[PDB]
Amino acid sequence: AMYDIYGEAALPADVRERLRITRDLAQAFHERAPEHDRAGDFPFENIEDLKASGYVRWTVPVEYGGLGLSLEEMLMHQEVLAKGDGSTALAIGWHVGILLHLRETGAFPDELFRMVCESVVKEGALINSCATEPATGSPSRGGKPETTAVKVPGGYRITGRKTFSTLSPALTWIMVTATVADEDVVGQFLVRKEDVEIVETWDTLGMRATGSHDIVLKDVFVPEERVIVIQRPGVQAERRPDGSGWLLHIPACYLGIALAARDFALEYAATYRPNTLPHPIAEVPHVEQKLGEMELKLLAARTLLYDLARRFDAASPEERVKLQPQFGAVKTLATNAANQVVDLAMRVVGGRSLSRALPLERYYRDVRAGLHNPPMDDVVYRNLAKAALARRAAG
Amino acid sequence: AMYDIYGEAALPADVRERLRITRDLAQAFHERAPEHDRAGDFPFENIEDLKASGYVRWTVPVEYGGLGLSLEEMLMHQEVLAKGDGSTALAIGWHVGILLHLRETGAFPDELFRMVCESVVKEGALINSCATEPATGSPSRGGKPETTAVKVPGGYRITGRKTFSTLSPALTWIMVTATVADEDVVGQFLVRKEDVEIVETWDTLGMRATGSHDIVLKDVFVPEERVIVIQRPGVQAERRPDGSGWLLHIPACYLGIALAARDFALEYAATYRPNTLPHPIAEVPHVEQKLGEMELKLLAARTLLYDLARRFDAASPEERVKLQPQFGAVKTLATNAANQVVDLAMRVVGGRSLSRALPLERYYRDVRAGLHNPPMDDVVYRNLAKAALARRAAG
Numbered sequence: 001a002m003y004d005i006y007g008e009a010a011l012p013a014d015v016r017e018r019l020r021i022t023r024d025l026a027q028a029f030h031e032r033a034p035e036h037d038r039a040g041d042f043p044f045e046n047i048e049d050l051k052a053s054g055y056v057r058w059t060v061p062v063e064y065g066g067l068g069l070s071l072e073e074m075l076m077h078q079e080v081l082a083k084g085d086g087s088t089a090l091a092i093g094w095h096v097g098i099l100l101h102l103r104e105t106g107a108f109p110d111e112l113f114r115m116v117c118e119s120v121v122k123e124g125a126l127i128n129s130c131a132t133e134p135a136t137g138s139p140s141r142g143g144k145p146e147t148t149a150v151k152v153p154g155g156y157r158i159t160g161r162k163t164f165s166t167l168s169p170a171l172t173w174i175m176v177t178a179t180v181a182d183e184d185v186v187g188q189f190l191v192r193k194e195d196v197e198i199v200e201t202w203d204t205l206g207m208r209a210t211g212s213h214d215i216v217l218k219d220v221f222v223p224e225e226r227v228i229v230i231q232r233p234g235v236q237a238e239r240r241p242d243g244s245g246w247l248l249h250i251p252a253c254y255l256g257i258a259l260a261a262r263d264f265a266l267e268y269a270a271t272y273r274p275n276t277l278p279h280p281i282a283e284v285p286h287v288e289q290k291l292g293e294m295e296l297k298l299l300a301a302r303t304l305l306y307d308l309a310r311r312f313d314a315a316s317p318e319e320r321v322k323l324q325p326q327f328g329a330v331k332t333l334a335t336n337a338a339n340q341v342v343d344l345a346m347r348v349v350g351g352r353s354l355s356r357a358l359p360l361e362r363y364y365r366d367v368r369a370g371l372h373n374p375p376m377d378d379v380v381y382r383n384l385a386k387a388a389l390a391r392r393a394a395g
Numbered sequence: 396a397m398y399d400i401y402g403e404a405a406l407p408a409d410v411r412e413r414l415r416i417t418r419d420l421a422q423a424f425h426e427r428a429p430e431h432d433r434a435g436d437f438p439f440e441n442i443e444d445l446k447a448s449g450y451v452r453w454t455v456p457v458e459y460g461g462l463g464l465s466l467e468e469m470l471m472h473q474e475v476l477a478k479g480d481g482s483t484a485l486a487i488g489w490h491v492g493i494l495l496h497l498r499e500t501g502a503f504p505d506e507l508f509r510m511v512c513e514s515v516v517k518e519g520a521l522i523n524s525c526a527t528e529p530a531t532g533s534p535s536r537g538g539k540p541e542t543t544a545v546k547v548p549g550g551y552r553i554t555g556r557k558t559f560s561t562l563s564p565a566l567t568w569i570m571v572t573a574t575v576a577d578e579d580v581v582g583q584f585l586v587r588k589e590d591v592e593i594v595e596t597w598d599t600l601g602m603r604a605t606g607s608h609d610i611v612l613k614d615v616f617v618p619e620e621r622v623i624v625i626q627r628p629g630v631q632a633e634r635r636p637d638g639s640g641w642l643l644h645i646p647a648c649y650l651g652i653a654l655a656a657r658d659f660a661l662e663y664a665a666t667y668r669p670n671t672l673p674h675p676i677a678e679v680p681h682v683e684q685k686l687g688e689m690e691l692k693l694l695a696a697r698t699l700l701y702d703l704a705r706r707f708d709a710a711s712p713e714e715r716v717k718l719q720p721q722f723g724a725v726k727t728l729a730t731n732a733a734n735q736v737v738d739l740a741m742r743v744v745g746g747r748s749l750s751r752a753l754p755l756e757r758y759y760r761d762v763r764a765g766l767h768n769p770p771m772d773d774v775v776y777r778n779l780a781k782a783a784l785a786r787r788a789a790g
């Protein structure tokens with residue numbers, strides 16, 4: 001799984017072939033990353049490659065023409081992709097991740113799930129969840145959206161606005177959360193991309209190519225068949241809970257960006273020799289220590305990541321609920337650790353690291369984003385604490 | 396000195412007037428910072444304001460028409476300026492700082508110093524030191540420059556290339572270090588801006604408006620009168636050592652950027668209220684802790700900064716040499732601390748902090764630069780250790 005350290009020999013034939021694919025895609029995305037980050041535009045060509053490679057249906061079940069891939073293997077590819085370009089990796093990770101979430105949970109009604117899965121496999125349709133609003137902050141904090149959903153003859157009229165709508169230029173389907181006006185309950189709703197207005201607001205420090213714009217919905221119709229859930233008193237969304245394990249795509253992406261940073265600084269340190277030294281800066285003690293620290297951080301966070309993915313794939317829905325606090329833990333570890341690794345990479349390279357002609361400054365910008373995908377650090381510590389308190393109590 | 400905490404009442408009339416000036420300039424530079432950072436261009440209008448305000452001659456001695464300002468007061472204004480815009484503050488800090496260095500050291504021959512000072516006071520001429528080259532890294536590490544200076548009838552022909560040439564578009568005078576070919580010794584040389592070729596290479600993560608381009612010198616003549624020093628065996632550069640105390644302009648600039656960040660996040664936290672809370676996020680425990688941590692960092696680093704400046708102004712040249720390790724210490728403290736403060740500011744604001752429509756992401760970019768102005772962190776710790784070892788030995 002951590003093949004770059006432990007060798008590819010372990011892996012089976014078909015995984016090795018899949019890995020050649022993602023490594024090629026990553027290398028292409030890398031060549032194209034500078035210009036897209038400079039323009040802050042959306043990389044339609046990267047999405048076309050993902051679609052033609054088949055990647056976009058890798059997590060769709062085998063019963064609908066997908067590959068049914070494990071979470072562990074999906075993370076591996078996401079990490080490879082992010083090492084090429086983080087914006088693209090993170091955008092597509094929402095898609096493949098969400099399909100795995102739906103696959104493992106039965107959160108979608110069977111008819112709706114089958115319909116969505118078809119469009120992915122036969123048309124390359126892409127999906128994402130667009131729930132963030134200014135008024136609520138992170139949906140993970142539990143705020144009722146001001147996006148309102150009003151009951152009409154065929155289904156619901158949705159009116160509102162969502163921010164950070166990743167992948168939106170290339171989306172077919174959008175899951176949108178909204179409060180049902182008259183009843184005071186939250187619902188989730190599957191909207192077609194064609195019925196919303198993208199307002200091109202995304203202009204950011206990093207992850208500039210995710211296309212995470214605003215979407216505006218003005219009286220948008222959702223037919224009853226496309227209503228995902230309405231969370232009334234006494235209802236489960238997920239028929240088989242997954243403990244949000246799919247959200248592990250987040251740490252995998254930000255570690256991938258960190259490995260790119262580490263690789264650049266290692267290459268740079270190995271070859272840069274000022275006229276003050278008889279050897280390259282890789283042999284200077286303080287540089288060596290920073291190099292070694294990067295290594296430790298990556299080792300720890302990645303080992304934890306893949307260990308937890310591997311447990312997720314073997315676990316029952318009850319065991320997956322119990323692992324949720326650890327899934328948060330690895331997110332907080334890996335994203336903070338990713339920031340620190342790029343920081344150190346930059347210190348190794350020095351003043352030259354500020355140069356836009358090298359990719360290292362883009363890594364520093366891109367990696368920042370992981371701090372603000374869910375779950376949040378304070379929530380992660382809290383839930384870790386509460387789970388520890390419950391284990392004591394169970395004794 | 397830290398008037399924002401401790402009140403302006405302490406300060407004398409003429410300092411208060413000077414402070415009104417720098418605060419106005421800072422506020423202008425702030426209004427103009429977004430567009431200059433987006434274009435990565437040089438702010439000629441900010442330099443014109445500095446010149447018309449008189450700031451550029453503030454550190455020139457009173458005997459040549461300057462104000463002769465203290466290092467302590469100079470830092471105060473530099474901090475105010477940087478809080479408006481860091482690129483401009485840091486660029487001008489080289490000028491005012493270098494004049495104070497020359498004033499306090501007699502490093503320039505008297506005739507040359509008087510000539511330079513005249514041009515500053517009567518024409519607004521600007522000066523900087525341009526010594527960095529790819530081949531040497533930081534000049535502070537002691538590398539012989541590949542820029543070579545060859546002895547001719549009138550003086551020297553200089554041929555070479557320098558990087559990170561801050562303020563270069565607006566410079567009149569440039570101090571350039573070069574190795575004297577035949578003799579194998581390093582010299583410093585005062586070059587006119589008109590005799591060099593600026594190659595517009597500066598394209599950076601932050602401090603994008605410093606104009607720190609490459610300068611190319613092809614057979615550039617320097618007349619004997621403009622030769623600053625040639626460091627042969629048995630020669631002092633500085634007739635009265637200053638222990639490099641002027642380099643304190645660096646920490647002051649990066650703390651100024653940190654205070655801007657802290658101010659934004661405080662304002663934001665005070666007013667942002669999601670629908671998940673009965674109060675603004677400033678009253679959330681984790682946000683409050685981050686707010687308080689920023690405060691502690693600034694308190695400590697700034698107090699140290701101004702304490703050391705105040706000692707520098709009272710100290711003899713022998714005592715200034717002894718304080719050199721502490722001047723490094725405050726640089727390492729304040730620049731690292733500035734990075735951490737902006738980091739926390741960003742965590743307080745959240746995902747919104749990535750937005751280019753707010754100035755906070757520019758602060759994160761700008762503050763990075765301080766890690767690579769001298770002295771370097773490993774050198775600072777080493778010299779702190781060696782000074783401690785010598786104090787023990789003196790017992």
Ligand SMILES: Cc1cc2nc3c(=O)[nH]c(=O)nc-3n(C[C@H](O)[C@H](O)[C@H](O)COP(=O)(O)OP(=O)(O)OC[C@H]3O[C@@H](n4cnc5c(N)ncnc54)[C@H](O)[C@@H]3O)c2cc1C
Pocket residue numbers: 090094128129130131132136137138139141163164165166167207210212369370371372373374376669671672676679682742743744745746747749
């Ligand atoms: C690259 C990127 C891609 C994204 N993609 C998507 C996407 O595809 N779909 C989508 O829906 N969203 C997306 N988002 C948005 C993301 O999911 C978050 O909703 C957003 O970043 C805001 O969360 P926050 O906690 O940073 O800020 P806020 O929730 O605005 O919080 C700001 C500050 O207040 C604190 N805070 C707020 N409320 C509380 C509370 N109730 N209790 C304690 N503390 C609180 C936070 O900890 C933080 O310090 C994306 C963000 C990024 C950076």
Ligand SMILES: Cc1cc2nc3c(=O)[nH]c(=O)nc-3n(C[C@H](O)[C@H](O)[C@H](O)COP(=O)(O)OP(=O)(O)OC[C@H]3O[C@@H](n4cnc5c(N)ncnc54)[C@H](O)[C@@H]3O)c2cc1C
Pocket residue numbers: 274276277281284287347348349350351352354485489523524525526527531532533534536558559560561562602605607764765766767768769771
């Ligand atoms: C905003 C900004 C403005 C600047 N303005 C100016 C200016 O006006 N004039 C000017 O001359 N320069 C200027 N510079 C350049 C600056 O002075 C440094 O020379 C430059 O940043 C390179 O130093 P460094 O230590 O980062 O990188 P390098 O010296 O290239 O070192 C790279 C890495 O190797 C290490 N290293 C290198 N050599 C040694 C050694 N011998 N022993 C131990 N470790 C070593 C460093 O610690 C670092 O990890 C500016 C830089 C910035 C960011």
